[PDB]
Amino acid sequence: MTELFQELLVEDADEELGWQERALCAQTDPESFFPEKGGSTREAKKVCLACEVRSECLEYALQNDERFGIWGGLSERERRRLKKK
DNA sequence: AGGCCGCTGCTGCTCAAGAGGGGTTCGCGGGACGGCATCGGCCAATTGGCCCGGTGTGTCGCACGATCTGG
C-alpha cells in the first residue's frame, strides 16, 4: 500500500546522528517502558520486538549498565543474568 | 629723555656583578580521617493472567427454499 517503494528514492537529508533516531519507542509512550508499582512488561516487549535497532539498544544499555526500565526487549533481571552469564 | 601711536617683521596654530640573609609560597607527598557507594537476600503487594459459571446479542458456517436475471 503506502510503502513509498521502501523509502523511495527521494531523500535530501543524507545525514544521520546515530541509532537513536531509528528508535521505535520514541513513537510511543515513554511511561509504559518503566512499569511502576507492580506493572507489566509484555506490551512494551512486543513494541521492542519490532524495533529495527534492538541489538544496538541492548548493546548500549549493557555497556552503560542501566538497572532500570526495559531495553532491547529485555527487563532488568534478564540483563542481569546475561551479564552474570 | 620717557611715554605713546602706529608700522613692520617674526613666530605660532590649524585645514588639507656578584654574594649573603630571611620570610613566604607552593608543591609534592603523605597519610589519616570520615564518609557514602556497592552487593547477597525477600516477601507479599498494585497491575495483569486465567479461568468457572450463567444466559443473551450478535457475527459466521453452513442447510432448505423463493425471486430474478441471464444463458
Ligand code: SF4
Ligand atoms: S529496543 Fe530499545 S530503542 Fe528499540 S523500541 Fe525497545 S527500548 Fe526503544
